[PDB]
UniProtKB/Swiss-Prot annotation:
This is Acetyl-coenzyme A synthetase. The gene is acs. Changing G520L: No acetyl-coenzyme A synthetase activity. Mg(2+) binds at V533, H535, I538. PROSITE patterns: AMP_BINDING (PS00455).
Length: 633
C-alpha cells in the first residue's frame, strides 16, 4: 500500500499536500500568474511581461516562455550567490580514487568560469556557436558548460562513452567549432582514451567545422598532438583574465543541444533555450528534492545526459546548492562505494538510477557494509521504471526506511521533472511516478487518439506546454513537429505508455515506440540496425529489447548475413565489436541471433512483435518455427 509522509518531512517540506493541490490547480488554470510569479526564482536583467506563449497546432508548433525578458544562466548559477554565499561549496568533486577530492566554492567556480569564458572569446567563439564537450566527470566539464552558457555559446555535451564514430556524427550535425576533452577519463581504476577518440573522430573527412581542440591534462598520459589545433586547458586558462561581465541573453536564445536517440533514424539534437528551461529546472529541483539551504546533494547521472545538465549542474547551482560530482562508478572498488561517498560527504539528498540500485541490490548488504547513511533525508530515482522490490530495497537499505523516494518521470525533450512525487505532499506507491508536476497536463490516449478516462491505460501525451519544454530539433523544426506533434494532433507525444490508477497515479510502463532502455540509456533500434547492416557481411538486421534483471532491457539482434557467408564465434565477437565501434559499448548487442527467417509482411515489412516475444523466451508462415528452433539453441 501507500507510504505515508513521515513527520520530519512534514515539519520541513516546502510543499505540503494542500499547497501541492493549490499550486497545481493555479498552474493549469492561470499559468501566466503562476509562472509569472514562479519565474522570480531567477534574476532577470530586463523583466519579462509575456509569460506563456505556446502552440502545439499542426504547422504551427511554437513554444515561448518569458520571451521578452533577458537573463544570464551563468549569473543565476554563480554571480548572484557570491555576495552572501561565495565561500559556500558549489561543487564537491569525489575522484574515482577516493584519496582525490575537491571542494569548489561558488567564488572559485565563478573565477574559472570567467577565465574560461574569456578563453572561449579569445579563441573567436561567439554567441550562437556550437561547442562540443566530450569530457569525463571532472569539474572542468562544468566550467566548460557554464562558460559556454555565460557567453551565449550553445554547448553540445557528448557522453564520454560514445565511440569516435558517434562523436564525429554529433560534430558534423551540429557544425561544432571547438572540441573540449581530456587526455583520458578515469573510471573503475581504468583510463578512457578520450583525446585519442577525438583524434579518430576528426579524421573522418566529413568533419570540416572544427578549428581547435582544448585538452585537459587529467592523467598526464602520452598522447598524440596536432600543433596549432591542439591546446592544453591549463595553458589557455592561466593566461586568461578572471574578470568577465555577463551579457543579457534573451529567454529564447538557444542554451544547449543534446543528441537523443529516437524511434527512427540517427540521434537528433534536442534543443533547449534559456529562461523557461532554467526556471523549470530550479523550480523542480527545489520543490521535488525539498531543498533547504545547507543540504548536500548528489545526483549520480553523467554530465553527458540531460539528468546531468538539469539536476547535477543547472537546477542545483541556480538554487545555490552544494552539488556533488562523482568521477567514478557507485560500486567500485566495492558495492559499498555509493554509501561510503554519502558518509564521506554527509549527503542529504541522493538521486540515482534503477540500474545502479539493481546492481547494488544484487550485492545485498555488501552495498551498505561499514556505512552509516544517517545524513540522508530524500532519495530519488530516474531514467527507467523501477519495480516495487527494487524500490523497497532502496527505501529500506539506503534510506533506512526514513527517506521518501521521488521517482521522477521526464525526458530529454521535457527539460525537467514531469510526473513525480513531492516528498512532503504526496504519499508514495512503490513503482509509481505518481502525480504531474506544476504546469503538466498528462493524458492517456489509445492508438486512435481517443482519450481514456479514470483508471485505464494508454499512450502518454502532454496536452499543453510547460516552461522547460525543448523548443526544437537543431536545424530541423519540421522534424520536431513530425516526431512529437503529428501522431496525436495538438498534443506532445512522449513515446511512453502508462497506466493511471483509481487514485489518479501514473505508472510508466515504458516506450511504445522502437526505443530501448538499456542500463538507463535511451537507444533506438533502427540506429543499431543501421550499425549492423553497415557491417560488410550483414544484409539485414532486426533489433529488439528483452527483459534483463540488472540492465532492464538487453539488446537482442536478429542478423541475416549476405548470401554465402557463414556464422562463427570469430564473427560473433566481430559483429559485437563492430557495433561497439559504430556507436559505443552502451549499444553492444547482448545476443546475436543468426537467421534467414526474418518474419516479413506481404509488403516486406518486419513483424517486430513476434521477434520481441520469441527473444523474450516465449507472409512466409514457416519462419516462426525456424526462429523458435534457433532461439532454443
Ligand atoms: C549501473 C551502472 C552504474 C553500471 O555501469 P558500468 O559498470 O560501467 O557498466 P555499463 O553497462 O553502464 O557500461 C558498459 C561500458 O561502458 C563504459 N562506460 C560507462 N560509462 C562510461 C563513461 N562515462 N565514459 C567512458 N566509458 C564508460 C564502461 O567502462 C563499460 O565498458 P567496457 O564494456 O569496455 O568494460 C551504469 O550503467 C549507470 O549509472 N546507468 C544509469 C544511467 C543513468 O544515470 N540514468 C539517468 C541518466 S539521464
Ligand atoms: C529522465 C532522464 C532520461 O531522459 P531520456 O530522454 O534519455 O529518456 C527518457 C525515457 O526514459 C524513460 N524514463 C525516464 N524516467 C522514467 C521513470 N521515472 N519511470 C519510467 N521510465 C522513465 C522513459 O521511457 C522516457 O521516455
Amino acid at each position: 500500500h501507500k507510504h505515508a509522509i513521515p513527520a520530519n518531512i512534514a515539519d520541513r517540506c516546502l510543499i505540503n499536500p494542500e499547497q501541492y493541490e493549490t499550486k497545481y490547480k493555479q498552474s493549469i488554470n492561470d499559468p501566466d500568474t503562476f509562472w509569472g510569479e514562479q519565474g522570480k526564482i531567477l534574476d532577470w536583467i530586463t523583466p519579462y511581461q509575456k509569460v506563456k506563449n505556446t502552440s502545439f497546432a499542426p504547422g504551427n508548433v511554437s513554444i515561448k516562455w518569458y520571451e521578452d525578458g533577458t537573463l544570464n544562466l551563468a549569473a543565476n548559477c554563480l554571480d548572484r550567490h557570491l555576495q552572501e554565499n561565495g565561500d559556500r561549496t558549489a561543487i564537491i568533486w569525489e575522484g574515482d580514487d577516493t584519496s582525490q577530492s575537491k571542494h569548489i566554492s561558488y567564488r572559485e567556480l565563478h573565477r574559472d568560469v570567467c577565465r574560461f569564458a574569456n578563453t572561449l572569446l579569445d579563441l573567436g567563439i561567439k554567441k550562437g556557436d556550437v561547442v562540443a564537450i566530450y569530457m569525463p566527470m571532472v569539474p572542468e566539464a562544468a566550467v566548460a558548460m557554464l562558460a559556454c552558457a555565460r557567453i551565449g555559446a550553445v554547448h553540445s555535451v557528448i557522453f564520454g562513452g560514445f565511440s569516435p564514430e558517434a562523436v564525429a556524427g554529433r560534430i558534423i550535425d551540429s557544425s561544432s567549432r571547438l572540441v573540449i576533452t581530456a587526455d583520458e577519463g578515469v573510471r573503475a581504476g581504468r583510463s578512457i582514451p578520450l583525446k585519442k577518440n577525438v583524434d579518430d573522430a576528426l579524421k573522418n573527412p566529413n568533419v570540416t567545422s572544427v578549428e581547435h581542440v582544448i585538452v585537459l591534462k587529467r592523467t598526464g598520459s602520452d598522447i598524440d598532438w596536432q600543433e596549432g589545433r591542439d591546446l592544453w586547458w591549463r595553458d589557455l586558462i592561466e593566461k586568461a583574465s578572471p574578470e568577465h561581465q555577463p551579457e543579457a541573453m534573451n529567454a529564447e536564445d538557444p542554451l544547449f543541444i543534446l543528441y537523443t536517440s529516437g524511434s527512427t533514424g540517427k540521434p537528433k539534437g534536442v534543443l533547449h533555450t534559456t529562461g523557461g528551461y532554467l526556471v523549470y529546472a530550479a523550480t523542480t529541483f527545489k520543490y521535488v528534492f525539498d531543498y533547504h539551504p545547507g543540504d548536500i546533494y548528489w545526483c549520480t547521472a553523467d554530465v553527458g545526459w540531460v539528468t546531468g545538465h538539469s539536476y547535477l549542474l543547472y537546477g542545483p547551482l541556480a538554487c545555490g546548492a552544494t552539488t556533488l560530482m562523482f568521477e567514478g562508478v557507485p560500486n567500485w572498488p566495492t558495492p559499498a562505494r555509493m554509501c561510503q561517498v554519502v558518509d564521506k560527504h554527509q549527503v542529504n539528498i541522493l538521486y540515482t538510477a534503477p540500474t545502479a540500485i539493481r546492481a547494488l541490490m544484487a550485492e545485498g548488504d555488501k552495498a551498505i557494509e561499514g556505512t552509516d547513511r544517517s545524513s540522508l533525508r530524500i532519495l530519488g530515482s530516474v531514467g527507467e521504471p523501477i519495480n516495487p522490490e527494487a524500490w523497497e530495497w532502496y527505501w529500506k537499505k539506503i534510506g533506512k526506511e526514513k527517506c521518501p523516494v521521488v521517482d521522477t518521470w521526464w525526458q530529454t525533450e521535457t527539460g525537467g521533472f514531469m510526473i513525480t512525487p513531492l516528498p512532503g505532499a504526496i504519499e508514495l506507491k512503490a513503482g509509481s511516478a505518481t502525480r504531474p508536476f506544476f504546469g503538466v497536463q498528462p493524458a492517456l490516449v489509445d492508438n486512435e487518439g481517443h482519450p481514456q478516462e479514470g483508471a485505464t491505460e494508454g499512450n502518454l501525451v502532454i496536452t499543453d506546454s510547460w516552461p522547460g519544454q525543448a523548443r526544437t530539433l537543431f536545424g530541423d523544426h519540421e522534424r520536431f513537429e513530425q516526431t512529437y506533434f503529428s501522431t496525436f494532433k495538438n498534443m506532445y507525444f512522449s513515446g511512453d505508455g502508462a497506466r493511471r490508477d483509481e487514485d489518479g497515479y501514473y505508472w510508466i510502463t515504458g516506450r511504445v515506440d522502437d526505443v530501448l532502455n538499456v542500463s538507463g540509456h535511451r537507444l533506438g533500434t533502427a540506429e543499431i540496425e543501421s550499425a549492423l547492416v553497415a557491417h560488410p557481411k550483414i544484409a539485414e538486421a532486426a533489433v529488439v529489447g528483452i527483459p534483463h534483471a540488472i540492465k532492464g532491457q538487453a539488446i537482442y539482434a536478429y542478423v541475416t548475413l549476405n548470401h554465402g557467408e557463414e556464422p562463427s564465434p570469430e564473427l560473433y565477437a566481430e559483429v559485437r565489436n563492430w557495433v561497439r565501434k559504430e556507436i559505443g559499448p552502451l549499444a553492444t548487442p547482448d545476443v546475436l541471433h543468426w537467421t534467414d527467417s526474418l518474419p516479413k509482411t506481404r509488403s516486406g515489412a518486419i513483424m517486430r512483435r513476434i521477434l520481441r516475444k520469441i527473444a523474450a523466451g516465449d507472409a512466409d508462415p514457416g519462419v516462426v518455427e525456424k526462429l523458435l528452433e534457433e532461439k532454443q539453441a
